[PDB]
């Protein structure tokens, strides 16, 4: 079909032409052995499933009526940061410790400038395969970026 | 990995699970009653001086029939109303734009006896 001939030839057309260095750096991806250890870490500090949020709000309503205590109750959550506009602000204020960028975003224009931003502020960053795999640890279809800030001792 | 073996050089549309209808509401609401009834098909008995000559001799009674009436439907209508077994039906459209059906009965039933029962003769 015509759609199959499109995507197979689009692979080839990018490779044959001389790609610039800004686009070329996304080929330098994280290897198989090191990557497995990273997602073992990031599946801890993952966000709440929809049922566990409903569990927490029932505990909130109980303590507020009989007790009256917000800000300390239902402890402090340690969780991975996600969303592009959300993550860029953390890197801009030197708060993010680790960053993980996807290699296959639809327009490259969206995510191309992040390597240059982390260079200036002195933030550790690493391009990694699968925007889907960043989505799996955060209850999403596709995540694009995923960064850490706070972590247990 | 390990590709699907395929002999032909063509690529056709793979047939899929085509699902049937299952609506949330009826479009019609009330089903309509019978458009063409027994009484509506056969309207009047023709009483021209030629028709009297056929009833006596030919064993055939004549009717004024409504348009949109098959020879299947006229055979069913005469059978239901007057309780008679029909032999054959022949139909024509008149010049004024009204259908006429010549109907011949079987040898058991006399056309003259049933004629005096219905009204005319």
């Amino acid at each position: 079909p015509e759609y199959v001939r499109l995507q197979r030839q689009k692979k080839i057309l990018s490779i044959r032409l001389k790609v610039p260095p800004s686009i070329a750096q996304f080929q330098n991806t994280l290897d198989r052995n090191t990557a497995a250890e990273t997602f073992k870490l990031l599946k801890k500090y993952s966000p709440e499933t929809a049922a566990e949020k409903k569990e927490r709000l029932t505990k909130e309503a109980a303590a507020i009526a009989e007790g009256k205590t917000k800000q300390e109750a239902s402890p402090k959550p340690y969780v991975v940061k996600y969303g592009l506009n959300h993550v860029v602000s953390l890197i801009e204020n030197k708060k993010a410790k680790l960053v993980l960028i996807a290699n296959d975003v639809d327009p490259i224009e969206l995510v191309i400038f992040l390597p240059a931003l982390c260079k200036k502020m002195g933030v550790p960053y690493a391009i990694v395969k699968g925007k889907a795999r960043l989505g799996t640890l955060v209850n999403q279809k596709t995540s694009a970026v995923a960064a850490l800030t706070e972590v247990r001792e | 990995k390990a590709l699907k073996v395929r002999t032909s050089a063509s690529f056709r549309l793979p047939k899929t699970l085509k699902l049937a209808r299952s609506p949330k509401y009826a479009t019609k609401a009330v089903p309509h009653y019978n458009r063409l009834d027994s009484y509506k098909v056969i309207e009047q008995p023709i009483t021209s001086e030629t028709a009297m000559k056929k009833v006596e001799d030919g064993n055939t009674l004549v009717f004024k029939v409504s348009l949109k009436a098959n020879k299947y439907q006229i055979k069913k209508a005469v059978k239901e109303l007057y309780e008679v077994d029909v032999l054959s039906v022949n139909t024509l459209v008149r010049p004024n734009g009204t259908k006429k059906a010549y109907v011949r009965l079987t040898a058991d039933f006399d056309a003259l006896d049933i004629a005096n029962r219905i009204g005319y003769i």
Binding site: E2, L6, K10, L13, S14, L17, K18, V19, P20, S22, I23, L84, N85, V88, S89, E92, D106, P107, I108, E109, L110, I112, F113 | -
Partner: protein
């Protein structure tokens, strides 16, 4: 603040990074049809500045249109008239190629309502635009008060009459001494000042 980086990056068009991406994308759009449905916006920063919102109701459409002048459709260059009107090849169309692109998608997708369009790419034979659309019949757009106004009956075919961004530019509706002959309405102003007003007592 990710979108502001894209706002500045898009302006640097003659760079090495963008001239690569420009030539790869323009090939892809030729192989697809003239009018065809786009999954997501190509320029996400540019779309939301024209009132795009990622939810059920808003729709995007790519479109390709021819470059160059309009030709006078008389056969064999035979005008039948005075020497003033004998010109054929160097005549030009009064509406922009944005307006031509915005109208064609309106006739295909009749149920949708046109909001705005923006420039994607170009070559020698063609130009490319991405028209954004809104569905008025969908209940998300009807109930929400921010995007409710578009559902009203007065906004049926804004692209045709010229009530879009490109339409009001082409008509020449701006405040100034430069815009006298067309401002309120070109034909409206002519119809006013070419008229004899008579009262009961002269």
């Amino acid at each position: 603040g990710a979108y502001k980086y894209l706002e500045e990056l898009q302006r640097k068009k003659q760079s090495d990074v963008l001239r690569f991406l420009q030539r790869v994308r323009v090939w892809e759009y030729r192989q697809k049809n003239v009018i065809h449905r786009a999954s997501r916006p190509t320029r996400p920063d540019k779309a939301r500045r024209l009132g795009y919102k990622a939810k059920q109701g808003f729709v995007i459409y790519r479109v390709r249109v021819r470059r160059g002048n309009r030709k006078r459709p008389v056969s064999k260059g035979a005008t039948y008239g005075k020497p003033t009107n004998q010109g054929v090849n160097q005549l030009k169309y009064q509406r922009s190629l944005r307006a031509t692109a915005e109208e064609r998608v309106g006739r295909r997708a009749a149920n949708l309502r046109v909001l705005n369009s923006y420039w994607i790419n170009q070559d020698s034979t063609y130009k490319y635009f991405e028209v954004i659309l809104v569905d008025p019949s969908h209940k998300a757009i009807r109930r929400d008060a921010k995007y409710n106004w578009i559902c009203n009956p007065v906004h049926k075919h804004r692209e045709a009459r010229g009530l879009t961004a490109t339409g009001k530019k082409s008509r020449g509706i701006n405040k100034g001494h430069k815009f006298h002959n067309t401002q309120a309405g070109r034909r409206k102003t002519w119809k006013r000042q070419n008229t004899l007003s008579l009262w009961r007592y002269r």
